[PDB]
Amino acid sequence: VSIGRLFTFFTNEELQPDSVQRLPKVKNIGDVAINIGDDATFLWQRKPEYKVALKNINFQAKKGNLTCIVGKVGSGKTALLSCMLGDLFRVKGFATVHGSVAYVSQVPWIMNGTVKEN
Amino acid sequence: RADTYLLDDPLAAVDEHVARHLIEHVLGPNGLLHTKTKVLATNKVSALSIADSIALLDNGEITQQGTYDEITKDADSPLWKLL
């Protein structure tokens, strides 16, 4: 029974590494787009009947500038944010993120330990 | 001290005074993270005013993009219609 469970787990569908190109970094002060994409599209499952997706996005924030995404719950704002980190399956388009990244989710993730440690 | 920060709207959870203090001192163009790319998904009026660019999301697609000046010129969504 346990081998069956473990095999199902090990075979569960992973995140596709090439959804976003995190490698690049730009040696300019504030003069480069951080995201790049023409008609980028992302999906939450590779299994059919996609309950959630992003379609034909060409979002473009710039180095050193604050940018915001506007939309009510379910409009795709969380999806776009998380796809910027590589957490969604790029079905069509292109995507990239430059330099080192960081992220804060809607729900604050906190780890048992010192506040200095968190 | 990273090269890009992506925030899923923690400001809407924090109090408004603290939200303003953060948007001024940490996340804003004059903040301690000035030189680093920042992106957010908040719909708060103060933050959207602080924005250097904005994008409007519609059921998985995008409907608008540009600076706060373009947002105000269009006035097509609450980002400019609410203020």
Q: Which 3 state secondary structure label does DSSP give A10? A: helix
Task: Give the separation between CA B49 and CA A99, rounded to whole angstroms.
Answer: 26
How many C-beta atoms surround the C-beta of residue B48 within 10 A?
20
Q: How was this structure determined?
A: cryo-EM
Residue matched to tokens 């697609």: B61
A15 and chain B: CB distance < 8 Å anywhere? no
Q: Which 3 state secondary structure label does DSSP give B1? A: coil
Q: Is B42 exposed, middle or buried (0-12, 13-18, 19+ CB in 10 A)?
A: buried
Q: Which 3 state secondary structure label does DSSP give A89? A: strand
Task: Give the separation between CA A69 and CA A57, rounded to whole angstroms.
Answer: 12
- The answer to whether A57 touches A80, Cβ cutoff 8 Å, is yes
Token digits of residue A5: 């469970």
At B64, give phi and psi (nearest 5°).
Answer: -155, 160
User: Which residues of chain A neighbour B39 with C-beta distances below 8 Å?
Assistant: 34, 61, 66-69, 81, 84
Task: Give the separation between CA B24 and CA B67, rounded to whole angstroms.
Answer: 18
Task: Give the separation between CA B33 and CA B44, rounded to whole angstroms.
Answer: 20
The chain A residue lying nearest B40, using CA atoms, is: A68
Token digits of residue B27: 């996340």
**β-sheet bridge partners, residue B53:** A67
Task: Give the separation between CA B21 and CA B23, rounded to whole angstroms.
Answer: 6
| Resolution of the structure in the document, Å | 3.2
CA of B25 vs chain A CAs: smallest distance (Å): 13
Q: Which 8-state DSSP code applies to residue A117?
A: T
Helices (H), A1-118: 2-11, 77-84
Q: Is A110 exposed, middle or buried (0-12, 13-18, 19+ CB in 10 A)?
A: exposed
Sheet holding A89-92, edge to edge: A53-57, A40-43, A89-92
Which residues, 6+ apart, have CB-to-CB distance to A37 below 8 Å? A57, A58, A59, A93, A94, A95, A96
Give Cα A95 to chain centroid, integer Å. Answer: 10
